[PDB]
Amino acid sequence: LADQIFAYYKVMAGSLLLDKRLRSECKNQGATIHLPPSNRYETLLKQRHVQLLGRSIDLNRLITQRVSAAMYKSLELAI
Amino acid sequence: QQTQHLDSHGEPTITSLYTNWYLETLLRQVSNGHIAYFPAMKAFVNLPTEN
Amino acid sequence: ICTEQCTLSDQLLPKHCAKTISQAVNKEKPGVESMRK
Numbered sequence: 395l396a397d398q399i400f401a402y403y404k405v406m407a408g409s410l411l412l413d414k415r416l417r418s419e420c421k422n423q424g425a426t427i428h429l430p431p432s433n434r435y436e437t438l439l440k441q442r443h444v445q446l447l448g449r450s451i452d453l454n455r456l457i458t459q460r461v462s463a464a465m466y467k468s469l470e471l472a473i
Numbered sequence: 474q475q476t477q478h479l480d481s482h483g484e485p486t487i488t489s490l491y492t493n494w495y496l497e498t499l500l501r502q503v504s505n506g507h508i509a510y511f512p513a514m515k516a517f518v519n520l521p522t523e524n
Numbered sequence: 525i526c527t528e529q530c531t532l533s534d535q536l537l538p539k540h541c542a543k544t545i546s547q548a549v550n551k552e553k554p555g556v557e558s559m560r561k
Contacts, residue, residue, distance in 0.1 A: 410515060419542035425549045
């Protein structure tokens with residue numbers, strides 16, 4: 395879950411900042427840079443007392459740990 | 474001087490020009506129904522209409 | 525001079541890279557004006 399969440403938001407960030415005129419031009423030559431399908435991750439990110447076998451699991455905390463590791467990896471790779 | 478409605482010489486600066494355009498063309502055509510606000514793209518995008 | 529520099533600096537806009545991306549998927553350059561032979 396953490397892996398695909400980070401991938402989804404990285405792709406959305408990259409797609410938001412791409413030149414719009416470039417997308418138009420590419421579509422006009424049949425080389426469309428496809429948009430990323432929308433997805434519903436908001437409800438999962440807000441979970442904080444998931445119940446399993448008598449334990450209360452804070453999903454938000456674990457997702458944050460994995461995503462922060464991924465962000466650090468991305469910055470390191472860029473540099 | 475170009476951040477004010479008019480310059481020190483009483484002439485239209487780019488603040489006024491762009492404000493006038495954004496209200497009297499973009500949002501007008503949005504209210505007509507030829508444009509829509511996509512929160513996905515964080516922009517306004519032409520709808521695929523006849524016009 | 526400012527007109528010339530604007531023409532030079534608008535050739536770096538992303539809108540001019542459509543052909544390259546289309547070629548890369550399906551299948552002049554800046555800095556050449558400053559090469560003094």
